[PDB]
Amino acid sequence: STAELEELLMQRSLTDPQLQAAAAAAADFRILPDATVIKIGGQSVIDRGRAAVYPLVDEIVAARKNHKLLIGTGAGTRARHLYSIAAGLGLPAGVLAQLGSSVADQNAAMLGQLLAKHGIPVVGGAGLSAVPLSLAEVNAVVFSGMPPYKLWMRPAAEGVIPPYRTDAGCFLLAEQFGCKQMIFVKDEDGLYTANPKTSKDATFIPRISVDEMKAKGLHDSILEFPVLDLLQSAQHVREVQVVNGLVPGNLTRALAGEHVGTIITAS
Amino acid sequence: STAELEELLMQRSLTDPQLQAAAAAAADFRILPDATVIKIGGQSVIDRGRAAVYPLVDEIVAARKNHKLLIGTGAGTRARHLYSIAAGLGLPAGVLAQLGSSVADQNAAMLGQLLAKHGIPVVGGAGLSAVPLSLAEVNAVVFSGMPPYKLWMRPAAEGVIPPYRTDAGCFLLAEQFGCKQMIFVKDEDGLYTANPKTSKDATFIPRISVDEMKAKGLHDSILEFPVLDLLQSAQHVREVQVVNGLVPGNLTRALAGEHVGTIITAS
Amino acid sequence: QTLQDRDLTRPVAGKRPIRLLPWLQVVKIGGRVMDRGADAILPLVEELRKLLPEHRLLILTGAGVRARHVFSVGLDLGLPVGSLAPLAASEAGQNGHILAAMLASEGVSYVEHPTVADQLAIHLSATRAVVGSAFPPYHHHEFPGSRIPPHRADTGAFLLADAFGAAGLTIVENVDGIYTADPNGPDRGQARFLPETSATDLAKSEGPLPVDRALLDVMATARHIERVQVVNGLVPGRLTAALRGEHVGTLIRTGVRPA
Amino acid sequence: QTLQDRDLTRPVAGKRPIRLLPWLQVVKIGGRVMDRGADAILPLVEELRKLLPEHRLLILTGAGVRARHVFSVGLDLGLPVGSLAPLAASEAGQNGHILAAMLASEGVSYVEHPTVADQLAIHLSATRAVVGSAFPPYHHHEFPGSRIPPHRADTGAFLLADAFGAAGLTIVENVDGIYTADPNGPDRGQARFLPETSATDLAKSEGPLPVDRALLDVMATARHIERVQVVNGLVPGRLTAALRGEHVGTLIRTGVRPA
Ligand SMILES: Nc1ncnc2c1ncn2[C@@H]1O[C@H](COP(=O)(O)OP(=O)(O)OP(=O)(O)O)[C@@H](O)[C@H]1O
Ligand SMILES: Nc1ncnc2c1ncn2[C@@H]1O[C@H](COP(=O)(O)OP(=O)(O)OP(=O)(O)O)[C@@H](O)[C@H]1O
Ligand SMILES: Nc1ncnc2c1ncn2[C@@H]1O[C@H](COP(=O)(O)OP(=O)(O)O)[C@@H](O)[C@H]1O
Ligand SMILES: Nc1ncnc2c1ncn2[C@@H]1O[C@H](COP(=O)(O)OP(=O)(O)O)[C@@H](O)[C@H]1O
Ligand SMILES: [Mg+2]
Ligand SMILES: [Mg+2]
């Protein structure tokens, strides 16, 4: 009933459960259903320079013949330095958000310049107006991975580090556009039972639900912990895959739908 | 099998699950099965002076014709003052334990002197050696409610306030002696959904399990929160009753097994 | 004053974030108040005019009925919540343009969200008040779950007020405050006025509120704002009284500790 | 060194309780070591004799086999855990009397638990070491649950060491340390030596340990002691090496943070 929804929208508060339930029955349009969102890790990939980025640039150029890619960048070490300065001053999470965004912008600019000669642009602006044309024509765009919350960033329960960073920024774009998948490109095969960099014998985990991660204490391990909650609330992207971008071909296979790293499912 | 238990006791560590399970099958002897342990609140009763204590003294004298009573005392306001001094210095929970014990001793001495002419003694010492004879002859004893942990007091997760105080001290004596019941005498009818002294419209709760208390956030409300865990581990005292000692007859009725305040059950 | 306070060995709360605009008063004007047109807006503009020499004001407007209409069209088109959010935020902006124009002769202008985030201190040194949109610029990055954008005008205004460490946030509504049920809804016969409530209490409740439910969630992580009053802007003088801390509507306690 | 460390606004750990005897070394002698008689005790006494000019020592003895016997009789009589606890503590006291007598010519005496709780500072100013019972005086107030008293010699000794804020607690055992299984039990073929472990890891495990399981619980609430080494007192020199922090047995991390 478009009329009962229209009637509730005019006459009730948007907080009214009846209106909320009526809105949930609305049709569900996917804006870019054939596109895939990829995050290129800031700390895990871009901060590693040529030996990490150049092979992934080659994979992206090869992949954009068969896949439509929205390529988001993490921020990494320079954002961590900015957070340490600003948090040491007691500046609130809303102020730090801007700082992390500029680092993600730097990394999108650097990645984008390696791809410019292939026609692939860096896109920005509140509306991301350059995405539809670029995606139709050169099958890929590069964007900065931070969400645009700025001073309206929701703080964590404790501390001033912004809890929604470039994992969330990339995941939410995949969800908003109704993309067919979301692939996180990092520097490890996927999720382990502990940090594989500091843990003697952590066990690789190839598939896990959000609830299983939380029960194992892995909520804030491989992805920003709020991304697990966004994942469970998501309408369109109900799972994600994390892969090792340092291994040639992992991104390519993942784009084709292969199970190559860790698949994290909402349910 | 006394022989298999004897064999495990000699040959395994006491931490061995096989030994632990064998010991759990041992017979269960109740030392004072016909006695009842009562706690007289320090803050809620004894600190209130004559108007609170004298009516309860009369009830105790009347009750010891039909019931055998171990009457433990709380500590109350003076222990709180000692804790505030010592905690403000950063002294550890093991040092504060001694301080609270001396206040509970004061209150047992004061209560005991009101009962001396009825033959009822104050008993103490590590072994409580005076209990069996007093209980057989005058049907009541007064003891100090603090556990004797002293410097070996287990601290709470946070802070230096001893978490095992006079509720625990009284409950553990009831459990050790296998008494037929444990009655906490306070200054409210029992457990409410919030502190009835500071809450406009808290709801009286006449019966609740330990798990139900924890789920409602009432773990540290009417009793010291560790007492709920001791209650669930208890072999002999699987429930307790809290009653309002300011209402004449509540103690008497409770001693007779009447449901007059809040009954808290292990299960 | 409590025994726990005296315990030297207990964990200590972290310091609060530094306050950016501690002398600022934030006032959120409901879109549905603006929807009443001149009958409501003109007395509110005169009241605001008299507040300018008394307070430094960030005036943030909500969206009102037009956002319900664009939601109706957008939902019929199937659009996701990150498409609906900027469409509604636009309506809050238009209410801000209208309100600022009414105050232009007093030196008041509407400013866009980049200016609010970054240059508010300079503009509030220039003039006594500025107007902005109360909606946050979440745009494509609105949270999924509900098909209705959760972070709306109340929520944006509180996030800003608490990030600034402002002296207060007052929400100006078309009703007296929060009731136990919609005072204009099918159960308005059962509606009881709530002079005071905590955000945690409101969050556990179910049923409609005059404030975003996300407002209660961001109050739980608030660092500075201790209370927010919802007052009736259709009653002249209640905004003025609320800005002086007088209790003339519903006080929501955020759960931030005072001391 | 972490980003979280730098965050001025995060909660700060409470101060630690003041240390009563910060210069003290606490040494727990296993009852089963004492049970071996002169063959074990005489070399241990000579080692202790040479440690007296180097360390100030509170030497706490466990109970050993005799407590197993009194448990056997008491359980057969049906007695509850608060009856068994002081009967076992008595055996730890008798081991203390024996060990102190061997050191009497060095000025060492056994002291009862009231003296340990209240007058240890005066006695350790008089003499270089004193002996006590490692069992705590929980007596009737032992916790129910297991029919075996949970708070035994390891647990008492750690509670004291941590309450004192002592420089260390070393546990002297009749094995090299903690294995993955009882190195004298039916699965000793599978027993793997653990040079280092955390108490949280040991607590999640099931199976026997050479230390009380309550030891791990009181380590979780510890405030000062960061590590406890379990060493083999049947190997002369390992106690001496452990008191200088050399890694000669199993190190248990309590989870207390260092900085
Ligand atoms: N429990 C409640 N207490 C008070 N009002 C309620 C309650 N539940 C629903 N309402 C309704 O909410 C109405 C206000 O609607 P709403 O909050 O959407 O307007 P607004 O705040 O002006 O708009 P915006 O959020 O766009 O600024 C009130 O007139 C009332 O009818
Ligand atoms: N995982 C394990 N690692 C090492 N020893 C173990 C383990 N499990 C069981 N044990 C046994 O525990 C024995 C030591 O027993 P126990 O700890 O009871 O003696 P103790 O500490 O001397 O006595 P007390 O606690 O009375 O001082 C070791 O000889 C070993 O056989
Ligand atoms: N259990 C885990 N499995 C896989 N990767 C992990 C795990 N824990 C942490 N990581 C990865 O290690 C990287 C950095 O870890 P973090 O805890 O942030 O410490 P730091 O950044 O100081 O190295 C992150 O990219 C994170 O995803
Ligand atoms: N929910 C409750 N129901 C019944 N009694 C309660 C409840 N909460 C607290 N009390 C009682 O109130 C008394 C004191 O409360 P407490 O929280 O210790 O504050 P204070 O000691 O400062 O008054 C205690 O005796 C306690 O048992
Ligand atoms: Mg509203
Ligand atoms: Mg041992």
Side-chain angles (χ1 to χ4, degrees):
Chain A
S1 194
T2 322
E4 199 226 349
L5 173 57
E6 193 187 300
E7 162 192 308
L8 291 166
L9 277 171
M10 295 304 152
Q11 297 177 338
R12 311 291 186 87
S13 162
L14 294 168
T15 72
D16 193 307
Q18 192 164 343
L19 182 154
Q20 288 278 335
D28 180 15
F29 179 76
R30 286 184 182 254
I31 298 170
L32 300 172
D34 295 326
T36 298
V37 175
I38 312 290
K39 171 178 166 180
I40 305 296
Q43 182 185 246
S44 61
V45 175
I46 298 177
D47 280 344
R48 292 186 190 279
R50 188 193 195 89
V53 171
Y54 274 37
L56 280 171
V57 158
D58 295 344
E59 276 199 74
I60 290 166
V61 170
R64 63 91 175 260
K65 319 163 84 183
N66 295 303
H67 309 283
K68 287 171 186 310
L69 309 177
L70 293 98
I71 308 165
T73 55
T77 310
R78 288 187 308 280
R80 184 160 300 179
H81 185 267
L82 273 155
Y83 292 157
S84 70
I85 303 288
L89 294 165
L91 285 165
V95 166
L96 278 68
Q98 144 77 33
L99 310 178
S101 189
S102 73
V103 175
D105 290 348
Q106 288 169 314
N107 291 339
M110 288 195 291
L111 186 52
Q113 285 168 31
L114 299 172
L115 294 163
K117 65 184 181 182
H118 303 286
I120 296 167
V122 177
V123 305
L128 291 177
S129 304
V131 166
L133 180 63
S134 314
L135 224 43
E137 297 303 282
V138 296
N139 277 358
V141 312
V142 176
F143 68 92
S144 182
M146 271 301 274
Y149 302 153
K150 300 304 161 121
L151 199 52
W152 300 260
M153 168 75 64
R154 283 179 62 155
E158 302 291 329
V160 293
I161 305 313
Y164 299 97
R165 297 188 307 281
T166 58
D167 294 335
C170 295
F171 175 79
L172 287 177
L173 271 184
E175 157 70 6
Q176 156 67 10
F177 288 139
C179 298
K180 68 188 221 183
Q181 58 177 331
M182 169 72 239
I183 299 167
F184 292 97
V185 179
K186 297 175 109 296
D187 62 358
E188 300 287 346
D189 287 346
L191 177 76
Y192 291 74
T193 47
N195 187 333
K197 291 191 172 67
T198 62
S199 292
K200 324 70 210 163
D201 55 307
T203 290
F204 179 73
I205 300 178
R207 178 180 302 272
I208 190 152
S209 71
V210 162
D211 288 353
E212 284 164 348
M213 285 181 71
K214 297 189 177 194
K216 291 184 151 266
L218 309 175
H219 44 273
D220 201 30
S221 45
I222 192 166
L223 298 168
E224 300 150 23
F225 74 92
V227 175
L228 310 191
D229 296 317
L230 298 169
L231 186 50
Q232 289 193 305
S233 303
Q235 311 281 350
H236 306 122
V237 188
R238 304 292 298 159
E239 58 173 82
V240 300
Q241 180 159 202
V242 188
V243 307
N244 190 344
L246 307 185
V247 182
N250 275 359
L251 176 54
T252 298
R253 288 153 72 198
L255 283 171
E258 286 185 45
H259 185 2
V260 64
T262 297
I263 292 173
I264 297 165
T265 62
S267 318
Chain B
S1 194
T2 322
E4 199 226 349
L5 173 57
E6 193 187 300
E7 162 192 308
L8 291 166
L9 277 171
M10 295 304 152
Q11 297 177 338
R12 311 291 186 87
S13 162
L14 294 168
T15 72
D16 193 307
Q18 192 164 343
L19 182 154
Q20 288 278 335
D28 180 15
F29 179 76
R30 286 184 182 254
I31 298 170
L32 300 172
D34 295 326
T36 298
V37 175
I38 312 290
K39 171 178 166 180
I40 305 296
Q43 182 185 246
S44 61
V45 175
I46 298 177
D47 280 344
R48 292 186 190 279
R50 188 193 195 89
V53 171
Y54 274 37
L56 280 171
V57 158
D58 295 344
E59 276 199 74
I60 290 166
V61 170
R64 63 91 175 260
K65 319 163 84 183
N66 295 303
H67 309 283
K68 287 171 186 310
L69 309 177
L70 293 98
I71 308 165
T73 55
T77 310
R78 288 187 308 280
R80 184 160 300 179
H81 185 267
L82 273 155
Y83 292 157
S84 70
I85 303 288
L89 294 165
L91 285 165
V95 166
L96 278 68
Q98 144 77 33
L99 310 178
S101 189
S102 73
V103 175
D105 290 348
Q106 288 169 314
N107 291 339
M110 288 195 291
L111 186 52
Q113 285 168 31
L114 299 172
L115 294 163
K117 65 184 181 182
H118 303 286
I120 296 167
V122 177
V123 305
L128 291 177
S129 304
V131 166
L133 180 63
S134 314
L135 224 43
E137 297 303 282
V138 296
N139 277 358
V141 312
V142 176
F143 68 92
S144 182
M146 271 301 274
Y149 302 153
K150 300 304 161 121
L151 199 52
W152 300 260
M153 168 75 64
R154 283 179 62 155
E158 302 291 329
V160 293
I161 305 313
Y164 299 97
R165 297 188 307 281
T166 58
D167 294 335
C170 295
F171 175 79
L172 287 177
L173 271 184
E175 157 70 6
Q176 156 67 10
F177 288 139
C179 298
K180 68 188 221 183
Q181 58 177 331
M182 169 72 239
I183 299 167
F184 292 97
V185 179
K186 297 175 109 296
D187 62 358
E188 300 287 346
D189 287 346
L191 177 76
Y192 291 74
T193 47
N195 187 333
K197 291 191 172 67
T198 62
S199 292
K200 324 70 210 163
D201 55 307
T203 290
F204 179 73
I205 300 178
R207 178 180 302 272
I208 190 152
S209 71
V210 162
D211 288 353
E212 284 164 348
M213 285 181 71
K214 297 189 177 194
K216 291 184 151 266
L218 309 175
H219 44 273
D220 201 30
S221 45
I222 192 166
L223 298 168
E224 300 150 23
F225 74 92
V227 175
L228 310 191
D229 296 317
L230 298 169
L231 186 50
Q232 289 193 305
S233 303
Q235 311 281 350
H236 306 122
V237 188
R238 304 292 298 159
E239 58 173 82
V240 300
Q241 180 159 202
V242 188
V243 307
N244 190 344
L246 307 185
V247 182
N250 275 359
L251 176 54
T252 298
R253 288 153 72 198
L255 283 171
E258 286 185 45
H259 185 2
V260 64
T262 297
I263 292 173
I264 297 165
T265 62
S267 318
Chain C
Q1 72 284 347
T2 203
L3 176 53
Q4 222 166 236
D5 290 349
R6 316 267 224 170
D7 192 330
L8 179 102
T9 72
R10 281 208 159 241
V12 178
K15 309 217 321 189
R16 305 185 171 187
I18 68 126
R19 300 132 92 203
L20 310 174
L21 305 176
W23 37 259
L24 174 66
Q25 283 290 349
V26 184
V27 172
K28 182 261 171 165
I29 306 302
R32 298 274 208 179
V33 175
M34 297 296 293
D35 287 341
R36 294 170 84 90
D39 286 340
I41 292 176
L42 292 185
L44 183 75
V45 159
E46 287 315 305
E47 181 158 13
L48 284 170
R49 186 189 319 285
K50 296 186 289 193
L51 295 169
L52 297 178
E54 185 180 348
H55 304 289
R56 304 170 78 183
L57 293 171
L58 175 57
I59 304 164
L60 300 174
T61 50
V65 70
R66 285 183 312 274
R68 315 307 190 85
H69 183 269
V70 83
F71 288 172
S72 186
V73 174
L75 287 169
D76 196 53
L77 299 175
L79 298 181
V81 72
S83 295
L84 299 194
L87 303 174
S90 175
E91 299 299 358
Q94 304 321 298
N95 284 328
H97 275 104
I98 290 167
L99 186 60
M102 302 305 297
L103 288 159
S105 63
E106 305 285 345
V108 177
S109 301
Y110 176 85
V111 296
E112 305 287 347
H113 68 85
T115 299
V116 169
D118 288 342
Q119 282 88 31
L120 197 60
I122 296 180
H123 292 296
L124 290 173
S125 311
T127 192
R128 304 163 283 169
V130 315
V131 178
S133 172
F135 271 68
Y138 276 27
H139 203 298
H140 300 298
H141 291 82
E142 181 56 290
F143 293 7
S146 174
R147 296 295 298 273
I148 301 298
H151 297 96
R152 302 186 293 273
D154 309 314
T155 307
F158 183 89
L159 284 162
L160 269 190
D162 198 59
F164 287 143
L169 165 69
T170 302
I171 291 177
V172 178
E173 210 75 25
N174 69 1
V175 282
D176 286 347
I178 307 185
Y179 295 70
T180 59
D182 192 341
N184 298 305
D187 296 323
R188 89 232 206 206
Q190 299 144 225
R192 289 153 264 252
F193 181 74
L194 302 167
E196 185 152 19
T197 178
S198 80
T200 52
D201 282 348
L202 291 174
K204 303 179 235 244
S205 88
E206 290 168 2
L209 298 172
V211 291
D212 306 342
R213 282 203 168 264
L215 175 68
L216 321 172
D217 302 330
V218 302
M219 283 177 169
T221 60
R223 266 64 147 174
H224 292 288
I225 310 294
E226 293 171 32
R227 57 192 220 171
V228 176
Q229 198 172 180
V230 185
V231 305
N232 197 336
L234 309 176
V235 184
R238 287 201 183 163
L239 173 58
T240 297
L243 282 170
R244 298 169 185 161
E246 307 174 9
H247 189 185
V248 298
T250 295
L251 286 163
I252 307 169
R253 299 184 264 109
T254 68
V256 167
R257 292 185 89 252
Chain D
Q1 72 284 347
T2 203
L3 176 53
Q4 222 166 236
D5 290 349
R6 316 267 224 170
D7 192 330
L8 179 102
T9 72
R10 281 208 159 241
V12 178
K15 309 217 321 189
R16 305 185 171 187
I18 68 126
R19 300 132 92 203
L20 310 174
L21 305 176
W23 37 259
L24 174 66
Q25 283 290 349
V26 184
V27 172
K28 182 261 171 165
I29 306 302
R32 298 274 208 179
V33 175
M34 297 296 293
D35 287 341
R36 294 170 84 90
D39 286 340
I41 292 176
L42 292 185
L44 183 75
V45 159
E46 287 315 305
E47 181 158 13
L48 284 170
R49 186 189 319 285
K50 296 186 289 193
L51 295 169
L52 297 178
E54 185 180 348
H55 304 289
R56 304 170 78 183
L57 293 171
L58 175 57
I59 304 164
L60 300 174
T61 50
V65 70
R66 285 183 312 274
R68 315 307 190 85
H69 183 269
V70 83
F71 288 172
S72 186
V73 174
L75 287 169
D76 196 53
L77 299 175
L79 298 181
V81 72
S83 295
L84 299 194
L87 303 174
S90 175
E91 299 299 358
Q94 304 321 298
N95 284 328
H97 275 104
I98 290 167
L99 186 60
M102 302 305 297
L103 288 159
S105 63
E106 305 285 345
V108 177
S109 301
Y110 176 85
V111 296
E112 305 287 347
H113 68 85
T115 299
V116 169
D118 288 342
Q119 282 88 31
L120 197 60
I122 296 180
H123 292 296
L124 290 173
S125 311
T127 192
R128 304 163 283 169
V130 315
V131 178
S133 172
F135 271 68
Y138 276 27
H139 203 298
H140 300 298
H141 291 82
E142 181 56 290
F143 293 7
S146 174
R147 296 295 298 273
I148 301 298
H151 297 96
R152 302 186 293 273
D154 309 314
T155 307
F158 183 89
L159 284 162
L160 269 190
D162 198 59
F164 287 143
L169 165 69
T170 302
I171 291 177
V172 178
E173 210 75 25
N174 69 1
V175 282
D176 286 347
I178 307 185
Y179 295 70
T180 59
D182 192 341
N184 298 305
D187 296 323
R188 89 232 206 206
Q190 299 144 225
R192 289 153 264 252
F193 181 74
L194 302 167
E196 185 152 19
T197 178
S198 80
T200 52
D201 282 348
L202 291 174
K204 303 179 235 244
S205 88
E206 290 168 2
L209 298 172
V211 291
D212 306 342
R213 282 203 168 264
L215 175 68
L216 321 172
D217 302 330
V218 302
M219 283 177 169
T221 60
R223 266 64 147 174
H224 292 288
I225 310 294
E226 293 171 32
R227 57 192 220 171
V228 176
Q229 198 172 180
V230 185
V231 305
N232 197 336
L234 309 176
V235 184
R238 287 201 183 163
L239 173 58
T240 297
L243 282 170
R244 298 169 185 161
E246 307 174 9
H247 189 185
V248 298
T250 295
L251 286 163
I252 307 169
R253 299 184 264 109
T254 68
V256 167
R257 292 185 89 252

